Design a binder for this molecule. Structure first.
Ligand SMILES: Cc1noc2c1-c1ccccc1C(c1ccc(Cl)cc1)=NC2
Length: 125
């Protein structure tokens, strides 16, 4: 019937900072992944109504996507890099939970996750 409201992308009462690692997570890691040929399913919240996946938000109770991440980064929502990295890992984990090995979407995630890991292996100070 409906989608849940999307995750918040601003919250005045949350502590936040710009750090060099967070600037890098947007400029390099996110904006690079974003251009990947497999990025599209992850660029916005799962529209379970459009996709006719009525079970999605029965199974996935902490939704996350790169559009939300992008907006959090642009709005300086995070206190540190680790908070953002945690949202990427929630996004990947959700994909692996809802789907099964060998599914096209899981292969897409696996690729993006490898790339993500490659890019965050070394961060700014
Ligand atoms: C993210 C996400 N996690 O689970 C799903 C998605 C998804 C999200 C947006 C559009 C299609 C899908 C799809 C999807 C299914 C097959 C392919 Cl070739 C691409 C996308 N599956 C459900």
């Amino acid at each position: 019937s409906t989608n849940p409201p999307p995750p918040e992308t601003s919250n005045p009462n949350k502590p936040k900072r710009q750090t060099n690692q967070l600037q890098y997570l947007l400029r390099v890691v996110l904006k690079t992944l974003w251009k990947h040929q497999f990025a599209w399913p992850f660029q916005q919240p799962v529209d379970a109504v459009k996709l006719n996946l009525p079970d999605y938000y029965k199974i996935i109770k902490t939704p996350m996507d790169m559009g939300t991440i992008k907006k959090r980064l642009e709005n300086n929502y995070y206190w540190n890099a680790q908070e953002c990295i945690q949202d990427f890992n929630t996004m990947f984990t959700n994909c692996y939970i809802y789907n099964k090995p060998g599914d096209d979407i899981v292969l897409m995630a696996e690729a993006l996750e490898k790339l993500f890991l490659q890019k965050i292996n070394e961060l700014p100070t």
